[PDB]
């Protein structure tokens, strides 16, 4: 017949709970969430406060530093050490001109001598920070070639004519040799030569070694693969034309699978501040001493008033020193504990019965 099927789904009789928010169940739900989030945020701020860091901005080293060891002004450097909270022994800095470079906008070597009163632990991260460099405009972040990242000898109509992501302003040069790391992202790669060690000032054969391996994820070598262009087909990018003065030989075409400093720059920063890892040591503790950074200056920032610096740290499991997560869990507890208190003291002094406040039968 036409009698509908009675199976408790079609009759809308599924098993259910019907939760009713009484204050005997809701007010212990706030106190549980409030006690959890003040124990969590109390343990986050304890582990966050023990994160030491060294931030030295060196963008003014050609002009505000001379050929002798003078102090860095306090505008540029910040130290955080939890066992030495009144630490103010300023790092020194020195400029070596290198007149045979003939670039004159950013050349030479900036020699930074910082002092660390406490030792950073086993894994030491040497980041570089960039401020006011905008790597997040909508034409910048789409300008690269996905085919050339995966190690393919892509044509001109697959690096320039692709649909969303293409090397649109920087595809090929005047004679026609297409740029191998193309687009604005790979062209404007950060230049500054950082050393492969920290020179222990005051000691010999105790230099803290650093490396450019283990600088990106190991899983990025499945995507960044060695190229299959010949030297004839490709040319260096128009701002890489000083590292490669003769262009690409049959020996100097860069393997981007093993070159992890390129692989970090091809991941653009989301925000105005950019922090990318460039040196690491996974082996040794960095002892408490005065060390020396020797930065080959090649990267211009002062034409857009941007800063340019160094972030030496051993982070935490949350990463970096940021006081936000510990404060905002403690705010989440002290709000859930306060509005457990406000609704309870409104309940003992207002309050109603659970049966007959209904407007139908007044």
């Amino acid at each position: 017949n036409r009698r509908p099927k009675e199976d408790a789904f079609t009759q809308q009789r599924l098993a259910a709970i019907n939760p009713v928010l009484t204050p005997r169940t809701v007010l212990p739900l706030y106190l549980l969430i409030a006690v959890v989030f003040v124990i969590v945020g109390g343990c986050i701020l304890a582990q966050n406060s023990k994160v030491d860091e060294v931030t030295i901005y060196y963008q003014d080293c050609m002009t505000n530093a001379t050929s002798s060891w003078s102090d860095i002004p306090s505008e540029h450097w910040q130290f955080v050490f939890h066992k030495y909270k009144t630490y103010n022994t300023a790092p020194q800095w020195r400029f070596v001109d290198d007149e045979s470079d003939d670039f004159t906008k950013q050349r030479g070597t900036c020699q930074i001598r910082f002092t660390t009163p406490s030792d950073m632990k086993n894994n030491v991260y040497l980041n570089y920070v960039l401020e006011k460099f905008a790597a997040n405009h909508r034409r910048y972040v789409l300008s690269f070639s996905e085919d050339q990242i995966r190690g393919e000898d892509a044509s001109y109509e697959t690096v320039h004519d692709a649909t969303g992501i293409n090397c649109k302003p920087l595809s090929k040069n005047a004679d026609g040799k297409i740029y191998y790391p193309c687009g604005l992202i790979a062209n404007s790669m950060f230049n500054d030569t950082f050393p492969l060690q920290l020179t222990n000032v005051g000691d010999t054969s105790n230099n803290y070694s650093l490396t450019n391996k283990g600088i990106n994820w190991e899983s990025d070598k499945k995507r960044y693969k060695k190229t299959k262009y010949n030297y004839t087909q490709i040319a260096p990018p128009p701002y890489w034309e000083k590292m490669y003065p003769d262009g690409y030989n049959e020996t100097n075409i860069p393997d981007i699978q093993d070159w992890e400093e390129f692989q970090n720059w091809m991941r653009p920063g989301a925000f105005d501040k950019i922090t990318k890892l460039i040196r690491i040591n996974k082996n040794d503790t960095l002892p408490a001493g005065e060390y020396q950074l020797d930065i080959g200056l090649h990267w211009p920032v002062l034409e857009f008033n941007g800063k340019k610096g160094i972030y030496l740290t051993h982070g935490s499991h949350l990463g970096g020193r940021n006081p936000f997560l510990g404060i905002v869990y403690l705010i989440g507890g002290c709000i859930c504990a306060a509005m457990a208190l406000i609704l309870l003291t409104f309940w003992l002094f207002g309050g109603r019965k659970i049966a007959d406040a209904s407007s139908l039968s007044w």
Partner: protein, 1172 residues
């Protein structure tokens, strides 16, 4: 003006070739459908584009197809709009294909058309061969048999009965429960067989199809045989069979077809089935405009802030990007405006009109598939026919019910009678007005009436031929006692004058009637009663059951089996019942006790009680004035129970005075003075001095739970106005039996008196049609107001005033004419506790609905069955049809179709009250859910100078409104229940939040827009403030600083905080919605666990390995889901403790076991329900 020719070629008014006639009559096909198959696609697309976001999406495809803004894949972004328009149109065609299968039942149901050539035909023997209903054309000759419906408007030619009389059942055209007599034409009255009608040539000069049920004008012209001459013969309305009618008590009726298709009166009093966009659906366009303003503000801010960046000087755009042109842009905030329009386009989501339509289609599927709206007798479930207005059934304030077939069962039952001032009759009809004080434990009396029927059936076993069973015996009274007979002696007849009064009363009920005799083809030893009115069918059948079996009629008189013996009564005269008379009288002949004498003559008059007590004898010395107090007390007691009363009065005549009366009766019979008042005075002269035998009482049976359904609807604040097609006093009795008139009300009867409609003249002064405006003002001092209806539409009470409006239809035509009298007529009807509108046309039923719907801003229901209710069903906001054994137009034109009236409580108070609250919650939950995600594309604009880059990887933007968040919203709109289905009927006062419109406001929308604006600040700036210090968030220092990885932080907070916001705003956490909230929470981790293992991710390549393995992801996740949900879970907990709604308090009682003693599926409007 049409002139239908038959059996004759047309004149030279056939100028149209390729098909000879010009006028092109419609075909006899009903439509009942929203779309014809030709213009389905143009009309359904415009119905979808009256939604304002659908012309918003169409603009984004036009503007996105230009390479100025650089939209990637401009032909793939049209795919989400195109497939939603196709899926909604396939759904609307499947919805509209189910109205066409009921058309094919109606257009194929086997009428009988003569096989003669019809010269009013298109281009593209002589038997009555069986043809289709759609094959009926204008000019056909149709033989309509017994008991089948009539195909078109038929000018009646001949009947099976001699002198050409029919009987039609106009309960489809009207509410008239009596059969109407339709006379055939006296020209073609001898035309009997199929060979006679083929040799007859004539034509009909008619008028236009003018939509008035009670009027027709026509001329039949036929050239006379053996004398060349035209002979006109007038055609009026009682010569006409209309399309809604059904031929009863006649073997065949032949006639000409004149009006087919939309020319018939039931089609002209109806319209095209409207599409009926719901009120929440209509008010959704204004909420989209609130988003068009919010989109405009965000694109205006981003358009001016981008141009402020493009005329700065010390920016890294000049050195490393190759936008080295320091000029070229002073205010380029036009091209940066509409980049943000493409960037922020998901702030009005594509999934809006497809989510809310899966809701409405699946809410219609659960109305269709429940067993408590299933009618087991008709084999008929509730059939939703409009699959998009289930939420309108939760806001209904006014019900405009029909009476006949809708409130009533079309079964009359003789229940009570008075014989010489003794009340004979036992019935528990509506003694349940006492539910205030005493219990509903009186199911013991329904068994106490039941044993008294069996004890009466075992006591009436004297020799009766057709004492068949109790199945045709509907008069339980064990006081049928023939007392002090066959006990003391054999002769007797000394005392017990009441026994002589009982057997003469029931004899008069077997004498004064016009009931004919036909043999039942099943069991031909038992014959049944073929009456005109069903009142007289119940009077003759109940005298048949107590002993006086009317077994036939002769040309001398009636054969009446008076308890075995078939005594013959010679009928002398018959005075037929009439509307002006309100009386039927029968002169019978007493037989002779003295030999050689011509004996006397007895007058037996029956009729209405109000006019027979005028016609009684005041000059008596018997008990003819002390019983008048007892009988008139009873007939007031019977009418307030809701029973049709009918006095029985007599006078014995001397046979010489009767011959003097017959001498004047033959004067008024040999002349044609029947239209004149000559015959009605001769009948009046004999009907003046009368002795009262007593009265009767007949129950017009309601449907099964009709006074229980109206009781639940009135407790919900819903107002019932019975709009009636038949007489005033009939609906007043149904008012008292449905508990709508209460016996202490003041019936404010309008009752116009003059036959003058406000149509012509009488401008400076009137004397006969200022009456209606007068006592509208006079009844506006007991209701002490004049005209203020702006204050009235702020009031949604019942009221408590114990008044009732009875307007008579002809006075309704003048109370609906001008603006100032409509305002006073509405204000009086709104202030009364019951409104009865009687003798009302199909146009005026729609007019009362449109008056209440347009003046007050309210929601109307309009249940009915019958083609007079179609215009009322179509012109209301919802329309309910009540289904029967037959195929009904009011079912096909309706929006829902229930088998019985009592299902309207289960339909409105359960399904509509759910479907209102399911969709008044979901729609603010839906715009909340999108803008928690789309606004983080704006808040990221602050940190890239509003240049126009995307925060999200492109598979997050596709699958947010499609996969990760789409299912908790949809299973809230389909399966959410504030309370159980029994509690919706135990507590009908929970319905009042829909009448007061307290669940869907544009104010409620703005707080969900403000709760959505707040959490996007939480969903963006909580991942921002863990990156903002030094951009390192991973435990191994390797860097998650890509913008797609920040978008993973934001999306996972937004998806979990949405799907747990939807969970907290569900009543009834069941296992089905609880499973698919969890699977929507776990498909955001699963898709990026799969898509970020492929090399096709292209920037995103190991996102789920790197982000989900980062402890800073799982620290941002729990604190940001807190601050998203904490200002709303606190506001609700403050609301639910100190300002609780009624439905929060009823849920508190339901947890405390105040409703556990009700069975699952408890139906209070059920006669066969258990005890509570």
């Amino acid at each position: 003006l049409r002139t239908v020719y038959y059996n004759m070629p047309l004149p030279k008014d056939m100028i149209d070739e390729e098909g000879n006639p010009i006028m092109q009559y419609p075909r006899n096909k009903i439509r009942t459908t929203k779309y014809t198959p030709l213009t389905f696609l143009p009309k359904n697309i415009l119905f979808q584009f009256h939604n304002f976001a659908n012309v918003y999406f169409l603009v984004l495809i036009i503007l996105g197809a230009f390479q100025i803004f650089g939209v990637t894949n401009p032909g793939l972004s049209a795919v989400p709009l195109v497939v939603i328009v196709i899926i909604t149109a396939i759904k609307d065609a499947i919805e509209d294909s189910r109205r066409t299968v009921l058309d094919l039942e109606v257009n194929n149901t086997k009428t009988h058309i003569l096989e003669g050539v019809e010269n009013e035909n298109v281009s593209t023997d002589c038997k009555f061969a069986k043809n289709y209903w759609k094959g009926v054309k204008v000019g056909d000759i149709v033989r309509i048999h017994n008991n089948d419906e009539i195909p078109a408007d038929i000018i009646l030619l001949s009947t099976s009965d001699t002198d050409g009389a029919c009987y039609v059942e106009t309960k489809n055209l009207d509410g008239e429960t009596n059969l109407k007599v339709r006379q055939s034409l006296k020209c073609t009255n001898t035309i009997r067989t199929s060979k006679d009608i083929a040799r007859t040539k004539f034509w009909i000069e008619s008028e236009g199809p003018h939509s008035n049920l009670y009027t027709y004008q026509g001329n039949m012209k036929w050239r006379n045989l053996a004398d060349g001459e035209i002979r006109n013969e007038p055609i009026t309305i009682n010569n006409v069979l209309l399309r809604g009618c059904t031929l009863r008590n006649t073997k065949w009726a032949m006639g000409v077809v004149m009006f087919t298709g939309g020319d018939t009166k039931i089609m002209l009093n109806s319209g095209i089935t409207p599409t009926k966009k719901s009120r929440i659906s209509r008010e959704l366009n204004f909420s989209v405009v609130i988003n068009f303003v919010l989109l405009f503000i965000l694109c205006f801010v981003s358009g001016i802030a981008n141009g402020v960046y493009y005329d700065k000087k010390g920016r890294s755009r000049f050195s490393y990007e190759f936008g080295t042109i320091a000029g070229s842009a002073a205010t380029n905030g036009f091209v940066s405006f509409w980049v943000a329009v493409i960037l922020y386009q998901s702030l009005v989501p594509i999934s809006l009109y497809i989510s809310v339509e899966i809701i409405k289609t699946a809410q219609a599927a659960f109305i269709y598939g429940d067993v408590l709206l299933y009618n087991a007798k008709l084999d008929y479930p509730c059939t939703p026919k409009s699959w998009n207005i289930s939420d309108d059934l939760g806001q209904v304030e006014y019900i405009f019910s029909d009476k006949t077939g809708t409130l009533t069962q079309n079964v009359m039952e003789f229940k009570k009678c008075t014989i010489n001032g003794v009340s004979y009759g036992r019935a528990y009809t509506e003694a349940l007005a006492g539910l205030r004080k005493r219990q509903g434990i009186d199911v013991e009396t329904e068994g106490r009436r039941e044993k008294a029927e069996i004890a009466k059936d075992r006591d009436t076993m004297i020799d009766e031929l057709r004492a068949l069973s109790g199945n045709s015996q509907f008069y339980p009274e064990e006081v049928t006692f023939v007392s002090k007979e066959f006990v003391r002696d054999l002769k007797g007849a000394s005392g017990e004058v009441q026994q002589r009064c009982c057997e003469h009363f029931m004899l008069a009920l077997a004498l004064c009637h016009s009931v004919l005799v036909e043999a039942n083809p099943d069991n031909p030893k038992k014959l049944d009663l073929k009456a005109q009115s069903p009142d007289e069918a119940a009077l003759v059948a109940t005298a048949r059951d107590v002993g006086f079996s009317f077994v036939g009629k002769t040309k001398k008189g009636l054969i009446i089996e008076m308890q075995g013996i078939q005594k013959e009564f010679e009928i002398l005269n018959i005075l037929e019942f009439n509307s002006s008379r309100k009386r039927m009288s029968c002169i019978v002949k007493i037989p002779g006790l003295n030999p050689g004498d011509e004996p006397r003559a007895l007058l037996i008059c029956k009729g209405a009680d109000s006019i027979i007590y005028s016609r009684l004898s005041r000059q008596s010395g018997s008990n003819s004035e002390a019983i008048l107090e007892k009988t008139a007390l009873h007939l007031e007691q019977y009418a307030t129970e809701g029973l049709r009363t009918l006095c029985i009065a007599q006078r014995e005549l001397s046979w010489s005075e009767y011959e003097k009366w017959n001498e004047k009766y033959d004067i008024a019979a040999a002349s044609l003075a029947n239209r004149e008042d000559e015959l009605e005075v001769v009948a009046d002269s004999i009907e003046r001095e009368l002795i009262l035998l007593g009265g009767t009482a007949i129950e017009d049976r309601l449907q099964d739970g009709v006074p229980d359904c109206i009781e639940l609807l009135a407790e919900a604040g819903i107002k019932l106005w019975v709009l009636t097609g038949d007489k005033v006093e009939t609906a007043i009795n149904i008012g008292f039996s449905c508990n709508l008139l209460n016996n202490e009300m003041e019936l404010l009867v309008i009752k116009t008196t003059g036959d003058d409609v406000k149509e012509f003249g009488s401008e400076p002064s009137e004397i006969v049609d200022a009456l209606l405006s007068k006592y509208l003002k006079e009844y506006f001092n007991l209701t002490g107001s004049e005209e203020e209806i702006f204050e009235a539409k702020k009031d949604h009470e019942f009221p408590k005033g114990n008044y009732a409006i009875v307007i008579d239809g002809d006075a309704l035509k003048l109370a609906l004419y001008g603006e100032d009298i409509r305002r006073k007529f509405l204000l009086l009807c709104k202030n009364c506790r019951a409104v009865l509108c009687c003798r009302v046309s199909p146009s005026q039923k729609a007019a009362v609905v449109k008056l209440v719907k347009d003046s007050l801003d309210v929601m109307t229901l309009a249940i009915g069955d019958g083609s007079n209710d179609v215009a009322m069903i179509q012109s209301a906001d919802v329309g309910i049809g009540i289904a029967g054994e037959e195929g009904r137009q009011a079912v096909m034109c309706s929006d829902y179709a229930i088998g019985q009236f009592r299902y309207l409580a289960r339909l409105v108070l359960v399904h509509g009250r759910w479907s209102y609250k399911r969709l008044a919650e979901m729609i603010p939950e839906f715009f909340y859910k999108n803008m928690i995600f789309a606004l983080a594309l704006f808040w990221y604009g602050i940190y890239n100078d509003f240049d126009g880059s995307y925060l999200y990887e492109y598979t997050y933007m596709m699958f947010y409104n499609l996969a990760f968040t789409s299912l908790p919203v949809i299973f809230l709109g389909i399966l959410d229940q504030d309370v159980n289905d029994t509690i919706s009927l135990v507590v009908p006062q929970l319905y009042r939040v829909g009448i007061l419109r307290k669940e869907w406001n544009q104010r409620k929308f703005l707080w969900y827009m403000l709760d959505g604006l707040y959490q996007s600040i939480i969903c963006f700036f909580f991942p921002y403030l863990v990156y903002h210090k030094n951009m390192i968030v991973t435990s191994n220092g390797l860097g998650l600083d890509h913008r797609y990885f920040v978008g993973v932080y934001v999306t996972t907070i937004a998806v979990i905080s949405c799907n747990t916001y939807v969970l907290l705003h569900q009543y009834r956490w069941d296992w089905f919605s609880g499973l698919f909230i969890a699977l929507s929470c776990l498909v955001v981790f699963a898709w990026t666990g799969i898509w970020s293992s492929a090399i096709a991710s292209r920037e995103f390549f190991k996102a789920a390995a790197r982000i989900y393995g980062a402890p800073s992801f799982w620290a941002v996740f729990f604190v940001a889901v807190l601050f998203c949900l904490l200002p709303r879970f606190t506001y609700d907990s403050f609301q639910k403790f100190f300002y609780p709604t009624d439905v929060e308090i009823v849920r508190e009682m339901w947890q405390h076991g105040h409703f556990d003693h009700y069975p699952p599926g408890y139906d209070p409007t059920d006669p066969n329900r258990p005890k509570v």
